[PDB]
Amino acid sequence: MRCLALDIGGTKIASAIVTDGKIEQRQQIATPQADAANAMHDTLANILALYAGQFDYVAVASTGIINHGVLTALNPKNLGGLAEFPLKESIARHTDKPIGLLNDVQAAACAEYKDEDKNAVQNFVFITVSTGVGGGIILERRLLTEPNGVAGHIGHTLADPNGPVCGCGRVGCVEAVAAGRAIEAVSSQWNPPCTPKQAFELFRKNDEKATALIQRSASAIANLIADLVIGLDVQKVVVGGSVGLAEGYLPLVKQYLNTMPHFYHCTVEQARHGQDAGLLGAAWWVADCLK
Amino acid sequence: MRCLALDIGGTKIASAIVTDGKIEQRQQIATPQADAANAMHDTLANILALYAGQFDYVAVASTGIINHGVLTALNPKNLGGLAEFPLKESIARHTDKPIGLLNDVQAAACAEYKDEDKNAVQNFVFITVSTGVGGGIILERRLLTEPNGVAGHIGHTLADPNGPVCGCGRVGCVEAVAAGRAIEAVSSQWNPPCTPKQAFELFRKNDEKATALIQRSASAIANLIADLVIGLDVQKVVVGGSVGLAEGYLPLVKQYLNTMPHFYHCTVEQARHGQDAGLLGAAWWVADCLK
Numbered sequence: 001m002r003c004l005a006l007d008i009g010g011t012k013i014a015s016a017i018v019t020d021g022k023i024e025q026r027q028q029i030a031t032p033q034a035d036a037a038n039a040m041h042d043t044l045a046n047i048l049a050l051y052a053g054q055f056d057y058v059a060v061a062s063t064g065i066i067n068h069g070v071l072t073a074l075n076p077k078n079l080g081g082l083a084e085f086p087l088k089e090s091i092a093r094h095t096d097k098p099i100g101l102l103n104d105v106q107a108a109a110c111a112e113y114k115d116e117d118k119n120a121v122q123n124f125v126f127i128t129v130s131t132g133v134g135g136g137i138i139l140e141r142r143l144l145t146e147p148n149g150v151a152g153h154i155g156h157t158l159a160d161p162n163g164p165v166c167g168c169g170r171v172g173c174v175e176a177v178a179a180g181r182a183i184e185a186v187s188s189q190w191n192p193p194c195t196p197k198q199a200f201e202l203f204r205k206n207d208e209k210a211t212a213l214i215q216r217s218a219s220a221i222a223n224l225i226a227d228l229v230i231g232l233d234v235q236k237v238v239v240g241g242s243v244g245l246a247e248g249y250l251p252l253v254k255q256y257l258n259t260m261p262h263f264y265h266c267t268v269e270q271a272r273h274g275q276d277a278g279l280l281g282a283a284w285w286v287a288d289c290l291k
Numbered sequence: 292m293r294c295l296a297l298d299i300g301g302t303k304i305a306s307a308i309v310t311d312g313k314i315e316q317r318q319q320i321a322t323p324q325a326d327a328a329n330a331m332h333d334t335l336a337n338i339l340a341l342y343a344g345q346f347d348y349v350a351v352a353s354t355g356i357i358n359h360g361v362l363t364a365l366n367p368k369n370l371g372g373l374a375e376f377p378l379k380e381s382i383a384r385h386t387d388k389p390i391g392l393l394n395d396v397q398a399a400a401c402a403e404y405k406d407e408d409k410n411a412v413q414n415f416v417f418i419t420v421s422t423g424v425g426g427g428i429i430l431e432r433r434l435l436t437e438p439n440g441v442a443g444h445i446g447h448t449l450a451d452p453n454g455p456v457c458g459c460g461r462v463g464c465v466e467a468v469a470a471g472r473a474i475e476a477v478s479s480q481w482n483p484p485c486t487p488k489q490a491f492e493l494f495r496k497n498d499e500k501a502t503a504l505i506q507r508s509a510s511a512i513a514n515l516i517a518d519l520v521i522g523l524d525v526q527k528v529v530v531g532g533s534v535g536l537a538e539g540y541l542p543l544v545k546q547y548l549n550t551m552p553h554f555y556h557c558t559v560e561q562a563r564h565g566q567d568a569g570l571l572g573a574a575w576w577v578a579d580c581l582k
């Protein structure tokens with residue numbers, strides 16, 4: 001009845017107490033990256049110290065392939081280099097109340113979907129374009145998680161066969177060319193260097209060099225959406241993250257989508273829950289899971 | 292209890308009487324292509340003349356987006372040019388016994404899956420590489436068909452952004468670069484012209500020109516499989532069709548798949564039911580549908 005939500009990311013770790021669908025007591029600490037396999041027990045330790053007592057169960061929403069309370073990183077460059085981490089057991093040191101875990105954008109998808117007309121929209125996909133690219137797939141009003149939580153990892157479906165090589169090891173993933181870190185990898189090597197946020201500012205001023213960089217990312221996502229519409233009959237796609245919500249972006253994605261045959265069209269919308277979706281969604285999904 | 296199976300394709304139309312899972316009375320006529328919107332009523336008319344009496348229900352398995360007894364062609368160049376055809380109503384002229392319709396490779400997938408250990412394999416995908424490229428997706432031991440039968444059309448997910456333009460209208464589909472007709476489109480313009488079957492013969496003799504053509508197709512499929520493993524946690528992929536079953540091909544696909552990180556691996560196997568899978572599968576799925 002009283003829930004501790006965590007949102008482990010590449011960059012920060014959000015936490016809060018989620019109680020009847022509202023968020024209170026919201027903290028966030030930077031995610032440790034050097035010596036992460038050890039540094040993270042200590043971070044979790046500190047988090048369940050400040051909250052202990054105020055929760056009955058914990059609801060984890062983190063990046064990586066979340067399966068059997070172990071986080072396996074597909075692209076570990078989104079974690080300073082960290083390949084896997086025993087997430088469930090490390091929260092077990094600080095409470096023996098029950099622990100539910102779930103990928104960070106699968107969780108966000110539950111937040112974004114359980115206010116939609118589940119009659120008109122039964123094939124739904126949330127897509128985040130942030131430090132990485134990921135998704136959470138709802139098919140027949142259900143979250144796709146079986147058997148090993150791998151379901152939804154559409155940032156590592158192919159975007160270009162001649163594309164850059166991904167952190168995951170495969171050539172050409174959507175993530176390798178569309179994510180915040182793919183943009184930053186090209187823009188931080190400009191003279192002078194640019195953060196992705198500054199690249200967008202030049203994009204909004206019609207700089208061709210910056211526009212090319214942003215178009216490289218929007219087109220890939222447009223294609224990924226088309227792939228989801230044609231391959232799964234996805235009716236709606238909601239797009240979030242620090243790059244999806246960038247001003248001018250979803251308009252640009254949608255432009256590419258409309259040059260495609262109408263077979264590839266569907267509703268494409270911005271996310272209503274921002275950076276709280278991970279915590280909210282992760283709570284509801286651990287609620288639903290204990291009946 | 293006694294079923295009329297049809298397998299409408301780009302090239303031929305197979306028919307048979309399917310009774311307790313065995314096929315008898317198997318005919319096949321060329322598929323009319325000139326004046327197809329009219330020519331096909333006549334072909335169906337002729338088919339329900341030779342069989343009438345020997346069936347209790349009909350089970351249709353055809354190419355295209357099969358929804359509400361209407362065939363909508365996504366790539367209509369797989370039908371001489373035919374954009375849509377009222378399939379259900381045109382079988383209604385010749386019997387008022389019940390009519391079940393289903394895409395041709397969704398149907399094949401039921402044939403290929405309902406002999407698999409439904410315990411080890413619950414995320415299963417049949418993939419055909421024939422005149423076109425298509426698939427039928429089983430997720431949680433169920434066929435993916437809702438809401439409009441579009442589910443499974445993975446031949447029109449992206450294989451190359453700089454790729455050829457597909458019949459469907461979109462740049463770069465797997466079909467546009469991997470199917471029999473994509474191969475034939477390159478090989479029939481050689482001097483001298485080559486059928487796809489003859490291109491494979493040169494491939495098997497290590498001709499670099501022919502090998503390049505075949506590698507262009509195998510790599511795309513390997514990637515499509517990787518996309519399915521990483522995006523849906525597909526455990527098994529079975530690969531059929533006049534190109535999947537070509538000697539040397541699935542070995543070549545699998546070679547590309549193994550150069551990828553182990554996250555993208557899964558069981559990849561040849562189809563056990565050949566050109567009868569469409570009829571068999573379509574029967575069982577119309578059985579299961581009337582309980």
Ligand SMILES: CC(=O)N[C@H]1[C@@H](O)[C@H](O)[C@@H](CO)O[C@@H]1O
Nearest residue numbers: 063064073074075132133134155
């Ligand atoms: C560590 C890791 O592999 N993260 C994946 C994926 O699982 C995340 O959900 C996604 C969200 O940022 O980005 C990344 O693609």
Ligand SMILES: CC(=O)N[C@H]1[C@@H](O)[C@H](O)[C@@H](CO)O[C@@H]1O
Nearest residue numbers: 354355364365366423424425446
């Ligand atoms: C007419 C048409 O659009 N056929 C599609 C698809 O629906 C078929 O199932 C597939 C099988 O040959 O090829 C083609 O990609």
Ligand SMILES: [Zn+2]
Nearest residue numbers: 156166168173
């Ligand atoms: Zn990748």
Ligand SMILES: [Zn+2]
Nearest residue numbers: 447457459464
């Ligand atoms: Zn296409």
